[PDB]
């Protein structure tokens, strides 16, 4: 059938990260103190 | 007018304890995986 003869040639058909930033959540930094020496002073006076 | 948050620098290990302080169901939202341990799961709609 010559009517459905198809010819095709070459053509030019030419058509991940994860991150979220919150603002802050710092813990108790510099965790050290004492309430004896000052108590000793104010109970030694 | 505000959004209640929960944050940490590490895992959020939501869990449940029985009277013997033993874990039955758990929901650990970690950095990479969101695990839901337990004896089941469900998703329902409003009508049931
Ligand atoms: C879940 O709830 C929170 C709090 O209601 C929603 O956050 C709100 O998001 C809107 C839309 O961006 C913020 O409005 C605008 O935000 C920009 C910053 O992106 C700011 O520059 C503008 O001036 C304006 O405020 C709103 O501020 C923000 N609220 C808070 C407290 O941060 C969030 O959108 C809700 N989730 C969904 C899916 O709607
Ligand atoms: C915070 O959550 C993450 C994500 O769920 C946890 O990471 C996972 O932790 C499990 C248990 O520690 C790891 O299983 C381990 O596998 C090794 C073999 O790879 C095995 O030898 C160990 O005995 C244990 O079964 C799993 O690999 C690990 N996965 C990833 C991607 O990190 C993490 O442990 C949680 N941390 C805390 C403090 O809850
Ligand atoms: C190609 O074949 C189909 C199916 O038989 C037919 O419908 C169509 O008319 C044919 N095309 C031509 C140009 O004859």
């Amino acid at each position: 059938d010559w009517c459905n003869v198809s010819l095709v040639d070459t053509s030019v058909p030419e058509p991940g990260i994860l991150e979220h930033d919150p603002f802050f959540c710092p813990p108790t930094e510099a965790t050290a103190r004492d309430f004896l020496a000052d108590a000793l002073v104010t109970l030694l006076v | 007018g505000n959004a209640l948050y929960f944050k940490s620098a590490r895992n959020v290990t939501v869990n449940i304890l029985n009277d013997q302080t033993k874990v039955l169901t758990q929901l650990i939202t970690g950095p990479k995986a969101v695990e839901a341990y337990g004896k089941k799961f469900e998703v329902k709609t409003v009508s049931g």
Side-chain angles (χ1 to χ4, degrees):
Chain A
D1 198 355
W2 293 86
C3 293
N4 265 323
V5 164
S6 297
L7 271 67
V8 170
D9 208 25
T10 174
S11 72
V12 297
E14 283 89 54
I17 62 170
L18 188 153
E19 185 173 4
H20 309 75
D21 275 338
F23 195 57
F24 69 98
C25 187
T28 295
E29 56 86 22
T31 300
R33 197 209 310 111
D34 166 81
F35 286 137
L36 277 296
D38 62 358
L40 279 171
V41 169
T42 51
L43 295 176
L44 188 153
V45 174
Chain B
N2 203 39
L4 186 75
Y5 292 166
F6 289 77
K7 309 193 184 179
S8 163
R10 275 222 164 203
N11 294 6
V12 172
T13 62
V14 170
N15 53 320
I16 301 299
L17 299 180
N18 210 35
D19 292 334
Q20 303 161 347
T21 71
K22 291 183 173 182
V23 292
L24 275 76
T25 59
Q26 282 195 342
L27 192 173
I28 297 89
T29 304
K32 319 173 189 176
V34 174
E35 289 77 338
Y37 304 70
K39 309 296 188 63
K40 206 158 81 178
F41 201 98
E42 293 180 353
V43 178
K44 288 183 182 172
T45 186
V46 184
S47 45

